[PDB]
Amino acid sequence: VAKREFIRGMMAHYRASLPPPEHSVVIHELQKRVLDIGMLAVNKAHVELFGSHVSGFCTPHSDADISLTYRNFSPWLQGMERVDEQNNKRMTRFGKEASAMGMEDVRYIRARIPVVQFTDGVTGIHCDVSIGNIGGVENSKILCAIRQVFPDFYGAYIHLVKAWGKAREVIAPERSTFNSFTVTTMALMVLQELGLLPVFSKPTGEFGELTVADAEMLLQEFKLPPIYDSLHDDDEKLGEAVFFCLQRFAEYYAKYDFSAGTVSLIHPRRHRTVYERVVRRHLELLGSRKRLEWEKHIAEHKEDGPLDENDFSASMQNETTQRPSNSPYVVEDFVNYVNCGRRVQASRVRHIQQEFNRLREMLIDKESELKFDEVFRESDT
Structure with a gap:
């Protein structure tokens, strides 16, 4: 019951x-x-x-x-x-x-x-x-x-992940844990791993990033399992699918090896050191374009020149510092390779991991004793 x-x-x-x-x-x-x-x-x-x-x-x-x-x-x-x-x-x-x-x-x-x-x-x-x-x-x-x-499937799943995350301060950017976009991305990668979302493996952007057209073209004919066609009118039935995915999500990040692995919707589980190479390649393209555009501006506004190499270097350093591959968590923004989890502090990892352990235990081990008001209990903090 x-x-x-x-x-x-x-x-x-x-x-x-x-x-x-x-x-x-x-x-x-x-x-x-x-x-x-x-x-x-x-x-x-x-x-x-x-x-x-x-x-x-x-x-x-x-x-x-x-x-x-x-x-x-x-x-x-x-x-x-x-x-x-x-x-x-x-x-x-x-x-x-x-x-x-x-x-x-x-x-x-x-x-x-x-x-x-x-x-x-x-x-x-x-x-x-x-x-x-x-x-x-x-x-x-x-x-x-x-x-x-399928709005109610993905919607219900992402909503509940965020509801839990905020309640348990897993989503609390002011306290140096995750933001909502980061946890959303993490949750969507679990769906990819289950075959419930495609992998966006062919980004075709000018800087190697994923575009809206890339995603649309891949999602247009993407198929959920046929059983999902029977889940549109009944939340008891859809709820069983969402619950299974929540179980898989809690388990996934309770156990996920972030020592090696990153979170990405382009290449799920891509190694940190491969993400580093991806970042370096992206930044080489970005830098080339940025320099060209700075020179184009200076040509139209000569009193703003000549190009300041120190300022340009500082701007590229800022691009680099948004994309570290050695932070506690690496969660990749698919439109620009920014590490959206980079601000999460090493001192907060114990909290995050233990909240995943807790969620896993309650949803899976103690399924027979589930209480919504307890799983989603707002942390005393």
């Missing part, structure tokens, strides 16, 4: 999480409202959402990430001191205009890569606005394509 009631409760929790009918209208109007702000602050403003609200692995109150671009924006120029300065002028004005229009708790964080955060004056959704998060937009579109294979 325990398993059956655990499954009923977990599917109810998923259903309660799901946005209402009109949520797409709400998000559309949020985008338009942020564009209104942008149009005051920069020329030819363009605003793209990314994150949970685009992938659809969201609740109505999930954080909104927003990418702001503008006339003659280039993704290649951030790190050039003179352009970074200009982006700070843009984000300074953006914050002032956000406040004027009635956004709450507006915070502009002046840095070489500036962000403006606020709570939407309408929805209360927390918004993080930055310049030109091109990878973020593409990444979310790929995750959306994944979800669309």
Whole structure:
């Protein structure tokens, strides 16, 4: 009886999480409202959402990430001191205009890569606005394509992984554990290993990265087992599939050897040292392009030249420091080879691994004694 009631409760929790009918209208109007702000602050403003609200692995109150671009924006120029300065002028004005229009708790964080955060004056959704998060937009579109294979299957699975993770502080980036995108990626790789998602083994991007078209073309005719065709109308039946996958997930990372292995949706279980080679190759392509684009900018704005080799080296060092292969966890962002788990501190590994051991024990060993309110018990912390 325990398993059956655990499954009923977990599917109810998923259903309660799901946005209402009109949520797409709400998000559309949020985008338009942020564009209104942008149009005051920069020329030819363009605003793209990314994150949970685009992938659809969201609740109505999930954080909104927003990418702001503008006339003659280039993704290649951030790190050039003179352009970074200009982006700070843009984000300074953006914050002032956000406040004027009635956004709450507006915070502009002046840095070489500036962000403006606020709570939407309408929805209360927390918004993080930055310049030109091109990878973020593409990444979310790929995750959306994944979800669309069977939304309630992938949705329920990812929702419950995140619900557990947040409850147990496995997802707690302020406390140096994982963020939600990282744990989402980890959970999706388990599905690949089970044959419940294809492996994105042929990235065709200009820098060897995975594109939205790569993913779409592979997912279009991807087939789940035939039994899945019978799981669309009944959450008891779908719940059994999701529960099995949750068991496999807890077990997988309770035991996974991160000494050798990385997490990747392009090459599941790829060795750390092979990821290092992949990173070096990617960065050689990125550097070549970046240098060309810096010179193109200087040619159009000569007073910003000549090219500063120290600044260029510092920018490439920053690209390198986003992609370490020797951190406690290596979890690969498929659109840019960033190690999205790199900030997780060695001192927090014991917590994470023990929470996996706990989840494994409760879902598998003690299946006969399952209680939703205990597995997903918010940590005392």
